[PDB]
Amino acid sequence: DELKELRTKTNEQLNEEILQLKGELFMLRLQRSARENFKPSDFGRMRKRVARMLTVKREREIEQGVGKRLSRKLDKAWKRSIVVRPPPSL
Amino acid sequence: RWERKDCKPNSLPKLHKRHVKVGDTVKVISGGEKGKIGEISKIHKHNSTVIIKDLNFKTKHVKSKEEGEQGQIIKIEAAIHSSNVMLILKEQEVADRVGHKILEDVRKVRYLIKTGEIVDTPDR
Amino acid sequence: AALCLTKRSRSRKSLARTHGFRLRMSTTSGRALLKRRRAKGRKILCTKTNPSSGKRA
Amino acid sequence: LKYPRRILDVYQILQSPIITEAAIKNIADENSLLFTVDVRADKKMIREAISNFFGVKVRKVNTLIRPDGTKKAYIMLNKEYNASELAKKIGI
Amino acid sequence: RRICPFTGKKSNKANRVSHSNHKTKRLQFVNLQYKRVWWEAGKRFVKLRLSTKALKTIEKNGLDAVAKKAGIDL
RNA sequence: GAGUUGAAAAUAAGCAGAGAUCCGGAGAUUCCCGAAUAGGUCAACCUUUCGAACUUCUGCUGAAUCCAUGGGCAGGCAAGAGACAACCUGGCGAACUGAAACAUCUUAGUAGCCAGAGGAAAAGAAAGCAAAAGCGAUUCCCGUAGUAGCGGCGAGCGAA
RNA sequence: AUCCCGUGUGAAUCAGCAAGGACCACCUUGCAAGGCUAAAUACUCCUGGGUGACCGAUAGCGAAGUAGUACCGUGAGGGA
RNA sequence: AGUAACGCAAACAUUGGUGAGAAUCCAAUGCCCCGAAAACCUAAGGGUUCCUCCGCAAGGUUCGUCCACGGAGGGUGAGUCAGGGCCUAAGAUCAGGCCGAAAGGCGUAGUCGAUGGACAACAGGUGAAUAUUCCUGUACUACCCCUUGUUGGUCCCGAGG
RNA sequence: GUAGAGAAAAUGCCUCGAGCCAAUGUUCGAGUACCAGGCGCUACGGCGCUGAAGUAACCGAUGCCAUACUCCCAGGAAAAGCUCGAACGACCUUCAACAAAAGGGUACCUGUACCCGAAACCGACACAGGUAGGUAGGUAGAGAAUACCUAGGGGCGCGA
After folding, report:
1. Superkingdom of this entry's organism (chain D)?
2. What angle do CA B96, B100, B101 make, to 5 degrees?
């Protein structure tokens, strides 16, 4: 059971999939208040999946060639502009 | 009790390593109830403590409910150390020492040294 | 006249400048003090205050 | 170019609601409701993480640091939107 | 510092012996001195700070040699 | 090679032979203060057009004599700036003490402080030592020698 | 004597110059005022392996549990 | 040695409660004391002591059901009030500059530094703990958006204040 | 106004030029609330509905005009905001600003609890000590003293 799909995703789909992950994770955190307790099974996975996405992107960035400093700057030029979106689940 | 906490190489407790495996059919070697077959059920791998079923008889007591109601006694079966259990198969009903082989395939398994039986058996 | 009591409710901000970490570091001697307070192994190696809220309950 | 008072990632801005009886009274009282935000949040970045995560226009964000370090944000939703019925889809 | 740009002529650590042979410490230092020598290659003066030995030396050996042997100008 | 989600027991769901827990080599992320580095600052903060100052490189090229310059301006790249147990080199360098007092001397060029650097540093290839005979860059241990010698020829220091 | 430094004068270079414990001769050694260089060598906050006529709970690290902790001092610092 | 003491000479008394236990907690009724305060705010400081519910081992110079003590939850909302985002005094740090065994010293433009100058909110409600912060009503300041026009800018600058 | 170029600085003339300065004052804000007092509930708090009058004379400030004014010598901080404009400086109704609807909307961080002439702050103690500033009522009094009291708070934590 492993994610041989992120390495197939290009940049864009990878990115929006990151945002959607963080959203659905926002909702999971939100559910704790009203105690719908399926989270422990499948909370950490969500959290522990965004990391995979980030790792894949950095490797891709690396073959292409950018310094860590440059990558950091690039990340900031992206962190700065992002609009929260409701999660797909409704 | 600090004198007996799990020992920690940099954020983790050393796991030791024991010959016995879950679902094993063991004879108690020496301690106490010497010479009594059993099926292990639960291995505490840091202490080498192993509870085999229906043997060790601990007569505890439990306050059940919040008003002092019930609290009827339970009888739990507590640990026994690992160096006190050998293996048996019902066919060669006899204790033995473990071993190893590399069978014709790649995999590598137990092999009771005093007999020809195989401890690993099927995968499940 | 107050009884020979050395410390009075002086402002934390005023105290910080005199013994503040920022103040402590600038002097050549001050940096030296940090050397020792770390080689011994202290944890609260100053007395400071913070321009937000100098306390966490 | 315009940047946010700081880079907090936006999503990390809100953490959990507050389920105290008093907050229930405020939901049922003012068209407010309480959030618990991490310390590096604003009235811009909280005022612009509810009008873009619940689809409700917000009126005020009275936020306050809390004696132990974390932050706590009363949000007054504009009257046209009504508090309790919104919190019902949230679970409160 | 009191160090000739053109020679490492430092002060001298020397104790001044008295007549009872009582030795104080008396740091002893060069007569390096404010002048303004006429750097020909720019037709123009430069203001320097010169241990007189080094002044004699520039004259005997010219200036620019002294310069590169210490690497000083501009 | 099986069971596991750190300490202690549950707790909640999970993951794993379609290798989980775990152990190694290489990676990636590494919020904020701190050399601290965008600017200020009461350290872990605020204001921020998002990013020091020193070298270096490429361009603009003050002053007087449009000279030549250096300085300044900019776009550059990314190297120095901190840390250290003891050992080492350098600079500054005490005193109580011993001399049955004490100014020469001795503790001692020790301690300490500052400045560098290394896993070792410093020294080093002969304008050396020798002695009518020979050696052959440095650095250490033994031993010559507590001898020669120096010394209010006192306390003591003491080579080759 | 050699050896490096402050002030001022300030040689010759090989049918020369320096040293050979003032200095002078003769002889003998080496030849300055430019630079670099491994080992044997001193060290331990440490890591791995082993050993102990070393301690074993006011001993051994000050410290066999949130030990430079509690506490005390404004502070350096002291410290169970 | 169960000895001195129990921290001022404002002063307690009752009835009825709570409780296993009342001089010591709660509520009355009475007496009394401060009132340029033994009152109400607020700068500093403290830093969780505030509130609610349990608890009584140690603490309280007695007692204890009670506490500023232990345990678990909870709490402090600002365009206007205070500070920062504005300014600068004493002072501090000072690029470059000068001086100095090293560190570093003197020093200019700059940069910080308010105890000071610029600048805009009041009344009444609410409530266990917040209210010039929340609510009601009426205000004020700054920046945009809309209209007509003039096209002429903002800075560095020289002046009033 | 004009004379030595915007702006004051200095010169002179002149202006249906005689009023300017500031707390109070009026009205709206408040045809409103607010309220003593009524009638029920009550696990004796609480709430409920109603709710009249809401005016004048005295004295008086250690607030206010106010850095009015007079008198003194010892002769009393600065820089920003803010108001006027020259090399009408780079830039130009595309990026601009003003009367302006005083029309519509928006409005950044940090502190706020509790003590604060203190049992929790500084004197090591729940210490007959100390701690900036603000408000300042009645009777008698010259008075912020004193004496007795409103508001509010307390009866001092061993007793008989």
Report:
1. Eukaryota
2. 130
